[PDB]
Write a protein that binds this ligand. Structure first.
Ligand SMILES: NC(=O)c1ccc[n+]([C@@H]2O[C@H](COP(=O)([O-])OP(=O)(O)OC[C@H]3O[C@@H](n4cnc5c(N)ncnc54)[C@H](O)[C@@H]3O)[C@@H](O)[C@H]2O)c1
Ligand SMILES: NC(=O)c1ccc[n+]([C@@H]2O[C@H](COP(=O)([O-])OP(=O)(O)OC[C@H]3O[C@@H](n4cnc5c(N)ncnc54)[C@H](O)[C@@H]3O)[C@@H](O)[C@H]2O)c1
Ligand SMILES: NC(=O)c1ccc[n+]([C@@H]2O[C@H](COP(=O)([O-])OP(=O)(O)OC[C@H]3O[C@@H](n4cnc5c(N)ncnc54)[C@H](O)[C@@H]3O)[C@@H](O)[C@H]2O)c1
Ligand SMILES: Nc1ncnc2c1ncn2[C@@H]1O[C@@H]2COP(=O)(O)OP(=O)(O)OC[C@H]3O[C@@H](O[C@H]2[C@H]1O)[C@H](O)[C@@H]3O
Ligand SMILES: Nc1ncnc2c1ncn2[C@@H]1O[C@@H]2COP(=O)(O)OP(=O)(O)OC[C@H]3O[C@@H](O[C@H]2[C@H]1O)[C@H](O)[C@@H]3O
Ligand SMILES: Nc1ncnc2c1ncn2[C@@H]1O[C@@H]2COP(=O)(O)OP(=O)(O)OC[C@H]3O[C@@H](O[C@H]2[C@H]1O)[C@H](O)[C@@H]3O
Lengths: 473, 473, 473
């Protein structure tokens, strides 16, 4: 289904930002607390007991750690050992980290010591450049896909982690290049603050400096904060007081032009990220098909149909990936060229002709999987081919359909074209929840109109375009 | 009972360190002064009289011995003879040495010339590798269980013992490998300084070097020092001055990140060590039982009970040792596997099936004693077996109970299961101080709830788990 | 087959050292040059060209880098960028790294900046603690399986890497704790220097210090160096001069008691490591079988046979892992107990009784795979079981055989026992190269004697023992 209109507007804006590679993610400690790591308060629980305090009655953990260091003549051995033993455990990644790794985001700023972001980026075969030291800023990893600025330290270097109040006090001098880099990113990139509480003194100082430098012309940043929920045993008045206090905090965040999105549940973050990826993943379509006969239409009429379909798809800011199949590939190229020339960007039209010969047939399967992996939505037209002097049904269209379905791609079999596409349409229609879960009345009507053979070229193309649009957004 | 919260926190931390085999013991001369050896001042009393001085009016015994050597043109014959005659006597070990030998500690550093630590380690059938010479460091005894670095010399080699000031002055050159080894251990292992005064120049030099090398990132070490007590004839003001001076000394110790635990009595050291061993000894439980009938519950319900009990025990970081008894062993295995697979560590589940046949029955007794010796807590379920076509009471459960009781293991007879376990529960209940000395109201309530047959599976399992928890800690 | 007697003696000694966890690996840059990284000379080739020099005509690359830094007023930007871009590439691990990760080795010392060792250790699900900074020495990762001391720096921190001569000059002051740690390890552990040239000034200084401290009582260390091979265009006399110079260098290495093993090829390193692992992997046997009938022998005679076989296996320092199968498990336990009691070590006898019940049968497969994974050699006896009132063939023995074969374990089906073991023996005999590649005449004779049903108990046990011995070594 869908979400609140505010969340939908945020999704549209951030998908617009990400596709231009001008988006950054600021991940706090809260993004990793769902993985399985104990909260920092629970880590400091024995430490507070040692100096005679209690974490449950303490609001400032930084001052708690500073008191612990003061008792031990400024020694951090126990704190370093605690953070090293806790944040270096072997835990499975959450879905949020994998989604963020799949997104085309080239900048991560983290206040968490764990390497979950690095691991998520490396699992997706993405070269990630982690920077948590001043000297590391002067060297850039070659062909990096994303840079993770760990602005508070790494788990493998506990002595450098910003935990106590002296660390924050000397941060402005020791880690000044990181402050300058974050100040530059907060004005040159659009941030999405996920799992961040906005209570960090370093972030307060940096944001205040940015606001003082730019006043009302600050760049718009987005934030995700869960609304306060009533505790199991609490009066109504205190819950309303907490909600009022959270509303004031959210309004105060927008002083730095950081728009806050209220989230009912923590699991809504994953649903937002999935939507953001889907609006990007489905932006590329895969025009599958091959035809020597064109069913009810004549060859010229169907060629015009395919040409105009590709022209409309390109006109609506879609990316066409075509295998240059016999009978549809040339007309797809013609439509794309007619729309574009009214040079060719490598992102608009992607041609992958299949090598002809017994040597290329062995690599055909991986070639086809590589093609389909580039796309998010698959559209199937006709699907017959001439074999043994007869118009047989082309099994490559079925193979593409199977590969796209294995990849959880949205399949749109145009049944009006006929042949193997009609069979695909019937197969999808028999079990509609399997291929299109949670569909609406409009989606079902459009799908049932895909097999309406009495439609003209324009009506069928409009049906397909509306179907792809409601799929993408 | 219990002790101060500071001591309890130290006990928890050090038990955590020992179970990971990252703990070391630094034993000074004070740990042996309880055995029966005369103090070093009393040994030097005739020597001081010889050169015209008096030990009671002298604070530095090292300089006293150096003066004695200076008078005799640098000859140490009398001092060597004195230390050889005093520290080679035949004395009985204290409880502290035996407890330290029973603990899983692989490193001992000693400034005492006596071989009490070696003897304690050898009494427990532990291969101990004593090192007091530079050449001995290059050779490691095969399959050693603990290495004792006698950093000041052995009693059987009085000429090499560090007694006079020239020995300390040339220690940095002669015994440099020992200094390097102690510097490595002070940063790679957690030390417990027992019976040490922290006035040794070698230790001061080594600790200062470690602090200069690591500054505030030094590893946390623990110390045990008795609080100053008022002498029989002393003013209040001088006693308060001594206490203030001791507090300043304790605070100065933490400059090297050595946390000091204030002990009211010397005998509290034994009570701390017993607690440290008990938190380790009781970490392993022995699930005893055998069932062909399952009392009030059905066979499936009781199988689920045993399965979930084992799953909860493993989930709470306990080690299950099972004799694979008929009716409980398979379900214990099922629970352990379900918890672990959500490979098998050799420490989590230990299976010792009893060999069936007249040849194995003769070794059954030693086999059972070996099994129970591995554990610290014994839990008994049901205990009937099919014999002569009838459900007789199984005497093996009673034998296990007797063996565990002979070993001072905590016995937890689950009386709700019934049969021989109900008899065991009644036997423990009749004389409760015999099996559970110094019990509290909560422990008595939990024990009386073990026979509450109206409890469900979850309630009974929670009762058993809480009982085992309050036993372990 | 086998190798030179010197290499065999080294293999025996080092396998003896590794099994006692007293062995360490010192890996130089040469161990990674087979992975695909370009040599350090090729990295410095543009740098030398920049300052007017040439690497091919230069023997000291450290001085070359120092000259490059001197030209640029002591700036290392280009060198840091070069090492970061080269040693952070994504390359596949070699077999040597995987073998070293599988070995029970708890200490690695590396002069290579790449993280290949860390990756190899993490692929085997081993917790590895990488240390390349002074502060990192004071913190130990909990439950680490191996510690990798990167004594020259990490690739992700190029500014700290020891590349130029100033770095070596200030190493003795900056990285002094690493020098002390390596000095301690060079006297407390047996090292295997793989892929190291022994031209590093730091290693020369450390080894000279160790020799000066211990003189002729230094611990024995092992090294692997490839013999010099004639270049494609070179005179005989210069090749003989190079060989003489290498022999002198090898002899000079033994001054520090570092025995050097001459290797004809680089690929002989993998063959040595495979032998070292095989002598450790095959030290544990898996006694598979289940019997209600005992073929030609009577029940008592076959029970004595199994008992004595287990007793002999334990007597020859083997580890027995038994699934407590019906008919062989009890007698295996009896034999092991009789041999050991003449406590039970967790490594000598490992019992894994199979949970009986429909709940445990679902986990039986993973349980059996976990059991067999612990072992290196599988021995199969009988293999029948009572089903439907008849002595059917037990399929669990066949399943174990299949699992062991999938794991490349040596299978020893005792065909004299009969039943499913005779079928296993015939199956192995039909295609002998598949299960025992590169066998000798003695191995074939022993295998053909395993089915000699006329053998007595002692003769059959001796045959099995000799077979397992020639397999292990
Ligand atoms: O200071 P800091 O912000 O670095 O650390 P923190 O622990 O203070 O982070 C708290 C923030 O993280 C979010 N958060 C907390 N637990 C979470 C979870 N399980 N899943 C997702 N988000 C969560 C909260 O919304 C909050 O805004
Ligand atoms: O110098 P050194 O420290 O090697 O020798 P030392 O004799 O100076 O040792 C004194 C230390 O040992 C402890 N100690 C003294 N007598 C003891 C006893 N009977 N039992 C337990 N602890 C005792 C004291 O607390 C003191 O800290
Ligand atoms: O100085 P350093 O020793 O650190 O670096 P280095 O490059 O000087 O290392 C050379 C050493 O590594 C070994 N080596 C070189 N190439 C190798 C390869 N491809 N496979 C295995 N071993 C190889 C050589 O035997 C030589 O002893
Ligand atoms: N002389 C040719 N010149 C150029 N291209 C040719 C020729 N001859 C055949 N082709 C095309 O090769 C592909 C593999 O051949 P195929 O296995 O027979 O394909 P198919 O079963 O018709 O599947 C159809 C899908 O495959 C791909 O185009 C097909 C053919 O149209 C597309 O992705 C389609 O959408
Ligand atoms: N065919 C069998 N297969 C497997 N195992 C069997 C069989 N037949 C009997 N057993 C078990 O042998 C042990 C010795 O036998 P037992 O002397 O008769 O034992 P018990 O009196 O019931 O004591 C119970 C305690 O002993 C041990 O399990 C018992 C039996 O359950 C445990 O530690 C119990 O906790
Ligand atoms: N009352 C029982 N008490 C104890 N143990 C029992 C009983 N009843 C059966 N067992 C054993 O369970 C295992 C699984 O049963 P199974 O699948 O029938 O085994 P199998 O086909 O005979 O394979 C044989 C191999 O499996 C394992 O022992 C077998 C049985 O002997 C070993 O590893 C063998 O080497």
């Amino acid at each position: 289904m869908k979400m609140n209109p505010i969340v939908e507007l945020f999704i549209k804006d951030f998908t617009k930002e990400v596709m231009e590679e001008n988006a950054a993610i600021f991940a706090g400690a809260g993004l990793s607390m769902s993985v399985g790591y104990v909260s920092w308060a629970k880590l400091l629980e024995p430490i507070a007991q040692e100096i005679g305090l209690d974490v449950n009655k303490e609001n400032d953990l930084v001052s708690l750690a500073q008191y612990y260091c003061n008792e031990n003549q400024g020694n951090r051995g126990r704190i370093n050992q605690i953070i090293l033993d806790e944040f270096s455990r072997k835990v499975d990644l959450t879905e949020n980290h994998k989604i963020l790794a799949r997104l085309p985001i080239h900048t991560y700023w983290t206040t968490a010591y764990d390497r979950l972001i690095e691991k998520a980026l490396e699992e997706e075969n993405k070269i990630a450049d982690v920077k948590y030291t001043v000297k590391q800023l002067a060297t850039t990893k070659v062909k990096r896909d994303a840079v993770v600025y760990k602005m508070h330290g790494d788990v493998e270097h506990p002595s450098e982690a910003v935990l106590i109040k002296d660390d924050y006090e000397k941060y402005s001098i020791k880690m000044d290049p990181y402050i300058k880099a974050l100040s530059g990113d907060l004005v040159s990139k659009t941030f999405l603050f996920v799992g961040f509480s906005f209570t960090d003194p370093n972030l307060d100082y940096i944001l205040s400096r940015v606001r003082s430098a730019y006043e009302r012309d600050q760049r718009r940043h987005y934030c995700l904060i869960k609304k306060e929920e009533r505790r199991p045993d609490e009066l109504e008045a205190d819950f309303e007081y907490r909600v009022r206090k959270q509303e004031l905090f959210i309004s105060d965040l927008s002083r730095f032009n950081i728009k806050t999105i209220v989230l009912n549940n923590y699991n809504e973050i994953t649903e937002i990220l999935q939507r953001i990826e889907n609006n990007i993943k489905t932006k590329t379509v895969f025009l599958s098909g091959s035809a020597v006969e064109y069913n009810h239409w004549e060859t010229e009429h169907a060629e015009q149909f395919i040409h105009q379909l590709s022209k409309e798809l390109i006109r609506k800011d879609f990316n066409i990936v075509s295998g240059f199949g016999l009978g549809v590939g040339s007309f797809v190229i013609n439509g794309v060229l007619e729309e574009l020339y009214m040079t060719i960007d490598d992102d608009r039209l992607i041609l992958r002709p299949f090598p002809q010969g017994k040597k290329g047939e062995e690599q055909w399967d991986k070639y086809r999987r590589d093609m389909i992996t580039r796309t998010g939505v698959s559209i199937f037209l006709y699907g017959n081919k001439i074999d043994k002097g007869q118009v047989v049904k082309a099994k490559g269209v079925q193979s593409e359909f199977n590969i796209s379905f294995e990849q959880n791609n949205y399949v749109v079999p145009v049944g009006a074209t006929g042949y193997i596409a009609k069979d695909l349409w019937n197969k999808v229609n028999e079990e509609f929840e399997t291929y299109y879960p949670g569909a609406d009345a409009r989606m079902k009507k459009l799908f049932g109109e895909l097999n309406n053979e009495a439609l003209s070229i324009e009506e069928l193309i409009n049906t397909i375009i509306e179907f792809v649009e409601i799929l993408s957004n």
